[PDB]
Amino acid sequence: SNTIRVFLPNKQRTVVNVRNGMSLHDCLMKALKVRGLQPECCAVFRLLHEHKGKKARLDWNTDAASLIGEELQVDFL
């Protein structure tokens, strides 16, 4: 752990384990496709832990292997 606590819409959550070489669109499929929500029409945030409430948007083609020990947030567009 080596984990990233990702919060999904509809007041849901999921923590995933990330191996090196994996982005944020490949290792987030089965952990999101099993809820009906399509990644194409869903955003992505990284909850800043210095303000608590103001997150920053990112790109789905980001290596999530570097965000070990963080905490994300997914929103619907």
Binding site: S1, R5, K11, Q12, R13, V15, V34, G36
Partner: protein
């Protein structure tokens, strides 16, 4: 309306991450993916009533036995999931109930038992062998198989009925 909280407790190798999945997305999952803390939600209509199932499956690996005593006083109903092909999972039911009772004190906890993987033939744990155990706790016993959609709906339905008793 009322929001039912279904906490799924069970060991490793069983079919927790296949039951909770095949209810929301109706899909069976092979690939053993070590879960840690995943929550689910679905707008269902149980007994002529459009309800809501905020499911939360837990980890069977005892490397996360710290936040157990956090959502087990949150969840309204529990769900002990094992497989009749795994004996060790059957022997760890006693160490679940006593650890669930430890949290919310009461002995009248809305629960129901699920013997997953009934589509195999590696049954070392019979029905009555599990019924006589489930009788002691006073909760029913349902036999499922998350590979063939058997008893899947009855798992997250009969459990709600137990919440609709207290």
């Amino acid at each position: 309306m009322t929001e039912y909280k279904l906490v799924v407790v069970g060991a490793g190798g069983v079919g927790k991450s296949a039951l909770t999945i095949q209810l929301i997305q109706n899909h069976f999952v092979d690939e053993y993916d070590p879960t840690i803390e995943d929550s689910y939600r679905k707008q269902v209509v149980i007994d002529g009533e459009t309800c809501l199932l905020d499911i939360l499956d837990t980890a069977g690996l005892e490397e996360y036995s710290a936040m157990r005593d956090q959502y087990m006083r949150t969840g309204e109903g529990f769900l002990c999931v094992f497989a009749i092909n795994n004996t060790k999972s059957f022997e760890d039911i006693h160490q679940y109930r006593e650890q669930i009772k430890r949290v919310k004190d009461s002995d009248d906890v809305p629960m129901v038992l699920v013997g997953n993987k009934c589509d195999l033939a590696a049954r070392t744990v019979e029905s009555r062998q599990a019924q006589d155990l489930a009788r002691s706790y006073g909760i029913p016993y349902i036999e499922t198989s998350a590979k063939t959609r058997q008893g899947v709906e009855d798992a997250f339905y009969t459990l709600v009925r137990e919440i609709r008793q207290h």
